[PDB]
Amino acid sequence: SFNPVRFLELPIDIRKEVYFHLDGNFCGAHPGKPSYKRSKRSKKLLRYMYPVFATYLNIFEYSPQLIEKWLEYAFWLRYDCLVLDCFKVNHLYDGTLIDALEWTYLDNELRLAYFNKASMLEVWYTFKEYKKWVIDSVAFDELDLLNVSNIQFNIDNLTPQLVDKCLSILEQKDLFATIGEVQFGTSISVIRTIRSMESMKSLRKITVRGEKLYELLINFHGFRDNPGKTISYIVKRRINEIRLSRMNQISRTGLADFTRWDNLQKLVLSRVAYIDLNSIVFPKNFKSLTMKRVSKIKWWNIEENILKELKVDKRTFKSLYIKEDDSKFTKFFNLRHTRIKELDKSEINQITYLRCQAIVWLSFRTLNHIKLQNVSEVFNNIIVPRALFDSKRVEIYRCEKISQVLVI
Amino acid sequence: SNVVLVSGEGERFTVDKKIAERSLLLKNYLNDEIVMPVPNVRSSVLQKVIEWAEHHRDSNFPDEDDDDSRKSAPVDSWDREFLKVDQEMLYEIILAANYLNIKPLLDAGCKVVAEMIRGRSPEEIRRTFNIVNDFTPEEEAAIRRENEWAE
Amino acid sequence: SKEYLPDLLLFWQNYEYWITNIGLYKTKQRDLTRTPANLDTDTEECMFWMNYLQKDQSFQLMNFAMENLGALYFGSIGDISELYLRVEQYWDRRADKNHSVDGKYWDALIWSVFTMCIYYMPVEKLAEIFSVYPLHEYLGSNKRLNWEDGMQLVMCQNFARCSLFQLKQCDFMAHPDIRLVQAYLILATTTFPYDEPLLANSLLTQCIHTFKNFHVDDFRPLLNDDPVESIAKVTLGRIFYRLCGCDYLQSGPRKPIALHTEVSSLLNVDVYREENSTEVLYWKIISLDRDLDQYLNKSSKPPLKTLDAIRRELDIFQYKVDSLEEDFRSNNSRFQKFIALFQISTVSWKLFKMYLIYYDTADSLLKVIHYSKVIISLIVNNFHAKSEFFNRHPMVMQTITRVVSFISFYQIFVESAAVKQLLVDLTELTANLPTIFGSKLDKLVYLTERLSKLKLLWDKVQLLDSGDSFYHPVFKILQNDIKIIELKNDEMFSLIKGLGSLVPLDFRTIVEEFQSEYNISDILS
Amino acid sequence: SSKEYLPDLLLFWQNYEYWITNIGLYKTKQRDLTRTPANLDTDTEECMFWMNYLQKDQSFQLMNFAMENLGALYFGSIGDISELYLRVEQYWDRRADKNHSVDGKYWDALIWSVFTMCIYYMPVEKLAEIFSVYPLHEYLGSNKRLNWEDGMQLVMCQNFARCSLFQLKQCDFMAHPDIRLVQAYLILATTTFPYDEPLLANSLLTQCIHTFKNFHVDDFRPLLNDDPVESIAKVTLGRIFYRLCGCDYLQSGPRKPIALHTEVSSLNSTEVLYWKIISLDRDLDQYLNKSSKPPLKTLDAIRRELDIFQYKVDSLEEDFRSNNSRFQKFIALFQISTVSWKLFKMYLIYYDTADSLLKVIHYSKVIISLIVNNFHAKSEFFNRHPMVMQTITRVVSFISFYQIFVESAAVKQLLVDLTELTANLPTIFGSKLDKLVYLTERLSKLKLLWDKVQLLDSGDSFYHPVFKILQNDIKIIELKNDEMFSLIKGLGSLVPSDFRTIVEEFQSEYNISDILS
């Protein structure tokens, strides 16, 4: 028996962290019959509460149990003060905890909908109904929090006619400065938004799923003379982040190049079969690159370079150089699944030693954040410097098959 | 190897040197038996805290920075009803774990307090929707007056 | 009700910066026409201080330095024994008059080592080595007073000012070399920047012009490079991080040419992570601290994710302090963990303080009480026997300034329960500081009892209100003193002096009465 | 061969240009730090020996000279010098004091820095009546017969600068950074002294930057609500910034890592444009490390705005007793000719445009015409002003490096007239002028060895010796200006197809170590 009379007078950190545990499923009820409804008076409900839930949720047009839920349900969940308080607290972070906020066009006012994990819509607002109370009741008078630019565009679920209709609404009324990022997932949908990307002045981050569009939209791969379909260089100086979700093998042709996109800073990668990082040309500065749940690892192919510039055999590199120490520090994190290996302080010391760090750090190419999650099928042994295994910019949480990780 | 601390009203709790390590903000106090004040937690609330910490000192607790084993985890079999005492004691418990910097009980109380929201009915949403005057009264009149007809 | 609390502690931020970090240390505005020029007599006295130091005194001072103080020169010089060789060459060297540049830069370094060694030198050993008289038949002001009555202070002053005159004698201004910067880094742990800010800031601008005229950026050793150049490179890098660390502690609006262009947790800034871990963690703590404290003059407000992130690497540094190699008999190791515990308490205390000012989050009073409690806990454990010299580091004059001025500004408006007890124990231990800081210590106690007298004017004079804001004499004079520090540290006045000929120029009764009885324009000295 | 030799050298010429004609021959002193002694001997007592030659009417006549001639030099810091007259008689009475003020011997330091620059523009006849040769030759004592056309008009100026800078170190400006450090530098470093002492002048300009930008002033425009003292003080302070950052450019190099020329970006009546020309001058040059050759769209924009630049100075009409006016337009016409010639060099070197040669040759004609009027009578001292020893270096080194590999018909004629007008320059530059003449002779014998040994190539990569000589030249200037050698003497304790032997017939004969000292 919760009451919302209280629970806006909890401390704002606890009000963070309860919403941290509440991701997009704020409510939970989720799993010849020619669409008989069996609702008593609802024939004008499905005119104006299920014209668009049929389209967006066509799996549950049948719905053996939950047919009557989402009509009467979201009459008030866009006004419940708890969920509106979520959209108070997460603007006050500039969108860290649960952003997931995109643009949709439906019912002729361009509802700024939010979707859940299973891409089922929950809450919607329109523009002057949103920034009249959702914004000004967190930002009191000051003018930097009255700028919202963490709103995605995300064309993989809009059918294309909705897409090129929701492009032409921001040209005459200047909401283009609001738009945050854009998600992708030849395809007729994706090319519209890029030749319609002339001047938004507000792009940071990019997500593309799959091989076939990645090969033609991100890799330079030698070619610089595309007649139409500009990726024009004036807005090419804006981006910070690259996301790759699911692949088969990133460099099927020869090469995962980023000779352009010089301002990129973070690269998240995801559930991908093959990565060989020598195929990535690693632009001049990016301090973060990461991957999660990967299944084949070649890992820069430079351990044998250390083997050849210290001029010994691999067997002699193993049999006496590694001593399996655990002094005081490494009991702090668990990592009971991992066998860290360490180099020596006596047989090489002060010389033939910092040159090894030079070979490592010429390859690591000005980055520090690695963030490896779940692993399987590593091939070449994992090497980390001292400067990155100490002070924990390396982290492998669920480390199921990995052994002979080694720190220099 | 027996360390003690004092409560909000003042009582003595011998624990052990190694059961006490789960309060990391007690481990900033063991740079040096030794007493430690926690003035915002009562006796029985930290009795619940110490019983939790004693029985899951027998287990392993994950990496506390991954957003994988936090945003989706089992609650426990044990911690269902021992953190289902009452509405109001859970608030005192989560303030207490915010003090003692034991993140896993803070998230474990967050599990149950998460459960008491995923599963509230749509008929308190009928009535407990405008507890706080966010919209000015003309438009909560209005919100019923573009919704005059479904009930 | 209590509606002054939101528009109060933000003005406390504006006061906390603009009194306790510039109005009490970085203001030395004098007049120019009065000030006597050094023609001589700042020359001739310290050949007399040269031969006042003999040879075995220098060797036992070096034994003092190697045995216990081994956490201050290690950022500068590393090994000790080469300076045994070097003081051997100085006790053979003085008998020449045509001394070269190299040897006298070497004496710049080694006088900087004695100056830093006499600052931290306990009086029980210093009394039985030196003798009191020959200073006072030089200068006659008092006849009978021991070292602890201010002779250590003036010895440190004269040691420093004519080690600097020996640099003046060697003309550093055309011969840049790294040992000028090493002389600074060994001298940065004395209070001379507090005694002379303008001198130290100008010569730190020459420290910057020494260093950044070397154009070294990456400090990892390369593959295609000489071994001796590799070791020179890594020691150059350690010098850079210690200079940035001792540049932050000095920082303010009196140097417009500042070095620090790095980041720690950002998520023209250039570099990040050019060393792994020996003593770089010091600069990591200081870089956490600068992200907290740039907002002292900034009118904006901190987003909470930043301060949550700072809390996170304080949880990391809570074990990075312990993970150093424990040395059971070595007491320079316990000097190092004194330094490390005191920094990680200090920065996190201001973190929780900022939590209380803007966001008023859970327990963010009682947390601040806990961290001030553990600061005073460290100060009382390092107080019994054979362990007294730790409290002479010139940051404990900073954090005690921070904590005392905060809690005394807390009891003027808010009368909480136990924070009376914390204030009374804090002022009691403030009077029990080690006896070297001189003018600034007693004038801190003057400011403390100034605000303690302001406590009694709170609950006696009632309030006046304008509809939305309370009007009160405290609410006038607490902006009046900020305005007078505005007027004092604005140097357009001096330009009107230095150019041309023309010169520039019932609330009230209690306001300028309390101005006249307790003036604030007195840190000028 | 084919025309393939030209960009291989001309896009290596500029990297040679900024690494020989500007740093190794100007802005470095290699210094062995185990050489120089203490300064209590040989650096104090002789200074108060160099005061004594200055008496009342001599300095007063010096001030009488310094008003009607120098209206582009003194006006950076003064206005009218009645303040100087008053300040020098309280100087003259202030010599009777023993423990002086700070402000007073700051005023002494500034008026000594006034005389230091002011005698350095004496034609030798008036300094012949306003000095006597005999009282000096006893301690420096090289010889006794030599007169002011050699030696003493250099070393007397150098030691006037030394006494000024001695009162600066003696009053200890590092504790009292008053502004008059900066307008000490502004008047003083007009003279040769930054070339004589680079390492002193660089750090002293760094202290001048500490003096300035610790005033935090950004508002410079005149107002209405404030006392007139603020307006006239800001009038002085803005122009002091302008000429400071200009002289910060003229000193800029890698031996000064603190700059304020970066803090200004690109786009009476005459003093406002002396920074606009330098403002267009910066971005002509900063392309050495920046390997990107400049797009044309900048250069023609500069080309049109120069046409309005000699549109306005056309509208200036001078006074003919006011030699003030001849000096200021001499700076004006010589500066626009400098930047115009310098940009046409870029046109010819990256685009090889026709008609650019003929305009270069007519645009090396203007500077020589301007020099040949100001030799006859009462007009000689403009040539001593030190922008000229920049541009004559550039014009001689460029025209020589254009005739070594390309013969142009009448451009030999301008080369020989230019290298004879080099030989009839005023003696006040001295060692650097002789240094340039040695380098010119080096390039001429380089031309001789160019025509005496011809090319060998196997593939598409050149093998002729001259290219290896100039690569050795840049490499050794790099190895000598490598400062991590100075670091390791800093720590000190750690101890510091025919191409086989066909360079030591040349590099052993003219080494490049005959530039450094």
Residue numbers in the entry:
A (entry chain K): 3 to 33, 49 to 202, 256 to 478
B (entry chain N): 4 to 35, 74 to 192
C (entry chain L): 54 to 320, 331 to 568, 589 to 608
D (entry chain O): 53 to 319, 339 to 567, 588 to 608
What do the study's own words say?
In contrast, budding yeast chromosomes have point centromeres with single nucleosomes that are defined by conserved ~125 nucleotide segments, including three centromere determining elements (CDEs): CDEI (8 bp), CDEII (~80–90 bp, and AT-rich), and CDEIII (~25 bp). In budding yeast, the centromere CBF3 complex guides the deposition of CENP-A, an H3 variant, to form the centromeric nucleosome in a DNA sequence-dependent manner. CBF3 is a four-protein complex consisting of subunits Ndc10, Skp1, Ctf3, and two copies of Cep3. Here, we determine the structures of the centromeric nucleosome containing the native CEN3 DNA and the CBF3core bound to the canonical nucleosome containing an engineered CEN3 DNA.
We were able to observe intact particles of the CBF3core bound to the CEN3-601 H3 nucleosome and obtained the cryo-EM density map at 4.2 Å resolution. It allowed us to build the structural models that showed multiple conformations for the major core region of the CBF3core. The major core region of the CBF3core showing multiple conformations is connected to the Gal4 domain through a flexible linker and moves as a rigid body (relative to the Gal4-nucleosome region). Examination of the available structures of the CBF3core in the free and DNA-bound forms shows that the major core regions have the same structure but display different orientations relative to the Gal4 domain. In some of the conformations, the Ctf3 subunit is close to the α2 helix of H2B and the L1 loop of H3. We found that the Cbf13 subunit was close to the five charged residues of the α2 helix of H2B and the three residues in loop 1 of CENP-ACse4. The model suggests potential formation of a salt bridge between Ctf13 K282 and H2B E117 and hydrophobic interactions between Cft13 P297 and CENP-ACse4 K1987. We mutated the residues in the α2 helix of H2B to Ala, deleted the three residues in loop 1 of CENP-ACse4, and measured the binding affinities of CBF3core to the nucleosomes containing the histone mutants. Each of the two mutants showed little effects on the binding affinity, and when combined, they decreased the binding affinity by only less than a factor of two. These results showed that CBF3core only made weak and dynamic contacts with the core histones.
